[PDB]
Amino acid sequence: EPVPAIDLSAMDTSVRPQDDFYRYCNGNWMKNNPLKPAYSRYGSFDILHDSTLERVHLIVDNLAAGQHEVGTNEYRIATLYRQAMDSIKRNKDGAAPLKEDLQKIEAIADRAAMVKYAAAKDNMGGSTFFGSYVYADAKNSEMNIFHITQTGLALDNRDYYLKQDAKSQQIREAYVAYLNKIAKLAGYDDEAATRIAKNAMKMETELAQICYSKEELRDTHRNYNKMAVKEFTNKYQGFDWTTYLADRQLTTLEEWDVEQLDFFKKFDSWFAKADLNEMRDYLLAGTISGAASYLSDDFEQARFDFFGKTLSGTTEMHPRWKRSVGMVSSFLGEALGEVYVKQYFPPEAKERMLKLVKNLQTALGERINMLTWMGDSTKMKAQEKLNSFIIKIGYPDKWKDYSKMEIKGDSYYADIKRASKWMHDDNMADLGKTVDRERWLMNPQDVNAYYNPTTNEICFPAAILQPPFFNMDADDAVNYGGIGVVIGHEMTHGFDDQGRNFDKDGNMINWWTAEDAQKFETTARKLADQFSEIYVADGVRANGNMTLGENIADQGGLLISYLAFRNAAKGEVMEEIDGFTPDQRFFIGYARLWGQNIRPEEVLRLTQIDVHSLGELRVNQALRNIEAFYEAFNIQPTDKMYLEPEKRVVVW
Numbered sequence: 001e002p003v004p005a006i007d008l009s010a011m012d013t014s015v016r017p018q019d020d021f022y023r024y025c026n027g028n029w030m031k032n033n034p035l036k037p038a039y040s041r042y043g044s045f046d047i048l049h050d051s052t053l054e055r056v057h058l059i060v061d062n063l064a065a066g067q068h069e070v071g072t073n074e075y076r077i078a079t080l081y082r083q084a085m086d087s088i089k090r091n092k093d094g095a096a097p098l099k100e101d102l103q104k105i106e107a108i109a110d111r112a113a114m115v116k117y118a119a120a121k122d123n124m125g126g127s128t129f130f131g132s133y134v135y136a137d138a139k140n141s142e143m144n145i146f147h148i149t150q151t152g153l154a155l156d157n158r159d160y161y162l163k164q165d166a167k168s169q170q171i172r173e174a175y176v177a178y179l180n181k182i183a184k185l186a187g188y189d190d191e192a193a194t195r196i197a198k199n200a201m202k203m204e205t206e207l208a209q210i211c212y213s214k215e216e217l218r219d220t221h222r223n224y225n226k227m228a229v230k231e232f233t234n235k236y237q238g239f240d241w242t243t244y245l246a247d248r249q250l251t252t253l254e255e256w257d258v259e260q261l262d263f264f265k266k267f268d269s270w271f272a273k274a275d276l277n278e279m280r281d282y283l284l285a286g287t288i289s290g291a292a293s294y295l296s297d298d299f300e301q302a303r304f305d306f307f308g309k310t311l312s313g314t315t316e317m318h319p320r321w322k323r324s325v326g327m328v329s330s331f332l333g334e335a336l337g338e339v340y341v342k343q344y345f346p347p348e349a350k351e352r353m354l355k356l357v358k359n360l361q362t363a364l365g366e367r368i369n370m371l372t373w374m375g376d377s378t379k380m381k382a383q384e385k386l387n388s389f390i391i392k393i394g395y396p397d398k399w400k401d402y403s404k405m406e407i408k409g410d411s412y413y414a415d416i417k418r419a420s421k422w423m424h425d426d427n428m429a430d431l432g433k434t435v436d437r438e439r440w441l442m443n444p445q446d447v448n449a450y451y452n453p454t455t456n457e458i459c460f461p462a463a464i465l466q467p468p469f470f471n472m473d474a475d476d477a478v479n480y481g482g483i484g485v486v487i488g489h490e491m492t493h494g495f496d497d498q499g500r501n502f503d504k505d506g507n508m509i510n511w512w513t514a515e516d517a518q519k520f521e522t523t524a525r526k527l528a529d530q531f532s533e534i535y536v537a538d539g540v541r542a543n544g545n546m547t548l549g550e551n552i553a554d555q556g557g558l559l560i561s562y563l564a565f566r567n568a569a570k571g572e573v574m575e576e577i578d579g580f581t582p583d584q585r586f587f588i589g590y591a592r593l594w595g596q597n598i599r600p601e602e603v604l605r606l607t608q609i610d611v612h613s614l615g616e617l618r619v620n621q622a623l624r625n626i627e628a629f630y631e632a633f634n635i636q637p638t639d640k641m642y643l644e645p646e647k648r649v650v651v652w
């Protein structure tokens with residue numbers, strides 16, 4: 001049964017599109033769908049996220065319906081799911097599955113044993129004091145190398161630990177109370193629970209101080225520092241890297257990528273000088289917190305009170321199956337994804353999507369060649385890169401081998417650690433081997449898409465090829481406004497403030513003249529400042545620097561897909577549908593992707609942690625730089641969407 005191209009009932013026609021295009025296209029849906037207790041936000045995207053997750057739920061119920069042999073993927077999935085859903089067993093076990101892990105931390109006797117403990121835990125997939133992983137060399141994209149990265153913080157953005165205003169201090173104290181509660185639930189007395197929470201926050205705050213900001217983490221060249229391992233470790237011996245690497249079985253490692261180099265220089269003296277008891281309590285708190293979703297309901301409720309009620313504003317938890325399905329999809333996603341495509345993905349969608357992608361690619365080449373600010377040399381290298389895109393649609397051509405993953409069924413938490421151990425070992429085995437450029441970094445059932453610089457690939461999972469993005473019964477204008485913009489957005493990531501640094505082979509090599517690079521940086525700075533002047537809440541501005549790459553990609557996707565849409569329309573009589581011109585339907589279909597309600601807590605949280613602008617701004621601000629949108633709705637200077645021409649910023 002065909003799905004309507006545009007859900008007209010979501011539109012609020014009492015709002016002029018020239019004044020508030022977001023609420024013209026979405027306002028009635030927003031009025032009629034106040035957020036339910038368990039949702040921090042909801043709207044077009046989350047509707048498709050939810051409907052796809054329910055498909056995966058049915059797939060899990062199908063695989064869990066039989067009894068299978070150990071060592072089959074069906075057994076792995078069913079056994080993780082069954083244990084996650086067994087509330088009675090999880091509640092009877094309580095904190096007992098955690099006890100040996102805590103005793104091992106309590107037994108750490110000196111700083112030397114602290115180093116060996118970090119290696120032992122990182123060998124299981126942990127990130128005890130810092131991150132590490134194996135992935136392509138940014139300067140040799142055919143080779144896998146070892147990378148080390150700054151501490152991962154529980155609140156994500158380091159600013160949570162530092163910012164000096166009332167709301168920030170309140171959040172910090174609520175986090176400490178969460179640590180106190182789970183320490184009590186793990187069996188510590190009142191005095192120890194207070195001590196652990198206080199010391200853990202102290203230690204994590206000191207690490208946050210020496211971390212890079214979210215903005216600085218996006219700087220491509222700043223966060224690549226390849227060197228001989230021993231050149232660094234001969235000099236910085238406050239943390240005993242030689243013992244750590246030996247216990248990681250990495251003493252054969254000649255070179256590595258020290259991504260946040262100034263973090264590790266400061267970590268050298270922090271680790272040498274930190275109080276041993278305080279470091280121990282930091283480890284206890286991280287271990288309890290990392291287990292809080294895998295034990296009894298008390299632990300999940302304590303975690304919900306902070307990460308849900310406090311940080312996101314929700315008042316109830318989602319049904320148990322949603323978290324359980326999400327968990328199996330994160331560990332065995334390609335096993336689920338193979339079933340998903342066989343059951344739900346029609347072959348005609350892949351063929352039509354490939355035609356659309358090739359149309360967008362042609363339009364991007366046309367757009368670049370028509371630029372008047374870019375010289376001929378840089379244009380030619382830009383054409384070489386866009387002609388070299390790797391295009392991945394629907395699903396991979398080979399499926400991941402999960403045969404080494406040991407799932408035993410003794411306890412939920414125990415099997416989570418085994419699945420995590422498998423993922424870690426699988427990553428480590430890539431070291432020193434040729435990079436697999438065909439691998440997917442998302443699953444077919446993920447409602448998302450991505451660009452990868454080190455492969456120059458664009459990837460569109462089966463799950464995003466659904467309405468309102470891709471609708472095989474819709475008119476072309478609406479599909480270009482939806483999935484067409486998504487395609488152009490991923491393509492523009494190859495040319496944003498990060499992607500432009502990588503060439504057609506995925507190598508971090510400069511292909512820009514100095515003049516053209518300076519013009520790009522000047523214009524990108526203006527787009528950052530433009531968004532940074534918009535308020536998202538009372539006294540809270542958008543972060544135009546953190547969202548710069550995504551706002552460039554949105555703008556490029558709008559410009560490229562519109563050109564592709566006009567190219568496809570050449571030589572056709574324009575026909576109005578629902579009284580809208582095709583040009584207008586392009587923009588309405590784009591804006592319908594973003595309609596949502598969102599709690600004020602969640603507005604603040606996403607501003608701190610999300611590189612994507614809020615849906616409202618991806619419509620009402622992004623379109624203010626699009627000449628075609630002014631033309632489609634004849635926007636005039638007294639209209640609220642209008643931005644003075646000298647203040648518009650067009651990067652591509």
Ligand SMILES: [Zn+2]
Nearest residue numbers: 489493550553
């Ligand atoms: Zn993006």
